[PDB]
């Protein structure tokens, strides 16, 4: 297989605009949203058909109740931060928890929080400690590190529960998460050389240009991997054609364990 990830984000806004919810929690597997909850609907729902097809209603009922309390937890946490920061107005509290299952079977886990989109606190499941970015975080870290039991529980969930959850979802959406659609790669002229690739999943891809067999990272203008909106992705990389000279340029693409090369005449 490839590497797969399970992530769970929470967003809190102190002064919501009409409609803009004051709590949103969305779950992802790799890049696919699987779950969503917000302060308005106040209920948790799947965002992928294979999530609903495979999870009993009592599951959604149960986690809906949990998220309601977690939404309340988040509201209070954000208040204390704003009080600590002596901040007023609208402010954002965020938290991302998740794990990775690698190709070789090794696992990773992470947990971190952010205030106004700023790295605030980062957990370390290998030292059972928190990393504070400023004094306000350290004050929170002092308290959080007190309940040594919670840190231990954190480690267990990240290392075991998260992976078990992620493995479960991988099978549930096998036909989508574990699929592969190879990219279609073409070369253009614009005057530079555009090596474009479209319609490929998974989204992770590597593209680069070679000068007769030697890469030039500095003089290559890469494009972002954008979503085509049909379930696949697209990306491109350009290079400047030296007019006073003439070399043999070639486009190289790596995607889902396949290496592919195109050569310019």
């Amino acid at each position: 297989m490839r590497t797969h990830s399970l992530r769970y984000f929470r967003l809190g806004v102190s002064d919501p605009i009409h409609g803009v919810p004051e709590f949103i929690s969305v779950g992802y597997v790799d890049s696919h949203p699987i779950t969503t909850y917000d302060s308005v609907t106040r209920q948790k729902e799947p965002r992928a058909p294979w999530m609903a097809e495979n999870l009993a209603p009592d599951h959604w009922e149960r986690y809906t109740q949990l998220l309601r309390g977690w939404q309340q937890m988040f509201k209070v946490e954000l208040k204390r931060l704003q009080r600590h920061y002596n901040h007023s107005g609208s402010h954002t509290y965020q938290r991302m928890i998740g794990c990775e299952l690698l190709e070789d079977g090794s696992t990773t886990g992470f947990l971190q929080y952010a205030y106004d989109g700023q790295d605030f606190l980062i957990f370390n499941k290998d030292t059972l400690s928190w990393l504070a970015v400023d004094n306000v975080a350290h004050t929170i870290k002092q308290a959080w590190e007190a309940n040594q039991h919670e840190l231990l529980y954190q480690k267990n969930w990240l290392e075991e529960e998260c992976i078990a959850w992620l493995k479960r979802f991988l099978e549930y959406g096998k036909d989508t998460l574990q699929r592969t659609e190879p990219p279609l790669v073409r070369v253009n002229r614009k005057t530079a050389l555009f090596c474009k690739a479209h319609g490929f999943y998974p989204p992770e891809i590597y593209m680069t240009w070679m000068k007769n067999g030697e890469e030039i990272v500095q003089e290559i203008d890469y494009g972002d991997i954008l979503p085509s909106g049909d379930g696949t992705y697209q990306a491109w990389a350009s290079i400047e054609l030296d007019p006073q000279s003439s070399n043999l340029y070639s486009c190289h693409v790596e995607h889902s364990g396949v290496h592919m090369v195109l050569q310019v005449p």
Partner: antibody
Amino acid sequence: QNIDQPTEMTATEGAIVQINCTYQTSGFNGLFWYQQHAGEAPTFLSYNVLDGLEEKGRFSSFLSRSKGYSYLLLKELQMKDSASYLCAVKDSNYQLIWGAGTKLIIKP
Amino acid sequence: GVTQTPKFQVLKTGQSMTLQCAQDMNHNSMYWYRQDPGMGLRLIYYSASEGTTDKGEVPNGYNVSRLNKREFSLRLESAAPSQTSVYFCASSVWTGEGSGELFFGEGSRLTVLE
């Protein structure tokens, strides 16, 4: 989803007793031990979520997540220790599953 | 601590009955349990946070009301002999915590009779 611990255990005053507990749950998020005297409110004793032995005073609690097994260990038993000890496990949905409990009898 | 009333009560089959429970600890989660000989505690209803309640494992014949952050009342709209038990109210700081331990009331003993 079941929790298994003995019904009654009798141990002599001043000795050591080891109350066993085995659990089979969909997920695991910690194992608790509660003390509950006759006609009294249960009270928290110990929490284990990672393997290993945790010691605090006379009481000690051991967890083996792989073996699905745990035990409360009471040292230098006192007459005041006669009570029921409740083994409870949190599952993947944070739902707390209670065992039937173990009634401990201390012979003077 | 956690205060639940009454300690004892006698009920005739078909009566209505309500158990009071309040917690001084500024907790968000509260629970109603029934403890019966032979089997472990069984949750009846639970309030994961203020303004939200859900059924537990045995929610038949019972109902609850999260009056505020402090009170969580349990009702028996019609008493039955199969309801004779000891009812414990508990609270914890939050639900979904790992090490969040429970805090129990003194317990309420009911005996329902024909």
